[PDB]
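Cross-posting from the chemistry board since nobody answered there.

I work mostly on the small-molecule side, so proteins are not my area. We synthesized guanosine-5'-diphosphate and want a rough idea of how it might sit in this target. Sequence and SMILES are below. Is it possible to get a predicted 3D structure of the two together?
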Amino acid sequence: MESIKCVVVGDGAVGKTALLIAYSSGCFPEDYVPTVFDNYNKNIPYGDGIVSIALYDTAGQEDYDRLRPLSYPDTDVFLVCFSLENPNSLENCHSKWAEELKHYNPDTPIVLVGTKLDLKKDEEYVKKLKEKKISPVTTEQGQEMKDKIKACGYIECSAKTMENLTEAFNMAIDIAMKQRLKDAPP
Ligand SMILES: Nc1nc2c(ncn2[C@@H]2O[C@H](COP(=O)(O)OP(=O)(O)O)[C@@H](O)[C@H]2O)c(=O)[nH]1
Ligand SMILES: [Mg+2]
């Protein structure tokens, strides 16, 4: 049994809490969604063993700049989240999230996670988005940002449809465990 700590950050409303509730329960939140989900644990097969991943939600607004980082000590991997239908939230992964995580946790790997993939793929939503002169974040743009912030992985997912949802957390686990292997004596 190995334990890892995963903290989820990103702009308000990109879907951090829904991501965590969907992973915890297997269902997109059916009732009231809290601002910040209480931290919880999940046991996941990994190699010949079991990883216990402890998941921490955060309040992403700038108002919480001093309270939110109190969650950061001893983190093994961060999920930096942006909505695939909000290009502004992608740019903030560079101007805000990468800078904050480098300041507090310079050695901790990051996974860049695109959320709300179902809306990116929803033809009617895309039309209405286009009426406001916005288009979805492309995978080309998301991968470019992955490199810009030196994230160890990138994935696009939907808490609503579960598309790539559990694999986003499998990606975070694999990155954390491989870093732990790299840091061990030979
Ligand atoms: N269509 C869709 N909506 C989502 C998804 N994830 C979150 N939402 C919606 O986005 C809004 C904000 O979600 P929330 O989890 O509170 O975002 P947070 O502020 O980052 O924690 C809510 O209306 C959610 O229902 C998703 O994968 N697909
Ligand atoms: Mg939330």
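Reply from a structural biologist on the board:
Welcome over. Reading the output above for you: Helices lie at 16-25, 87-104, 117-120, 123-131, 139-148, 165-182. The domain at 1-186 is CATH 3.40.50.300 (Rossmann fold). Happy to explain the token format if needed.
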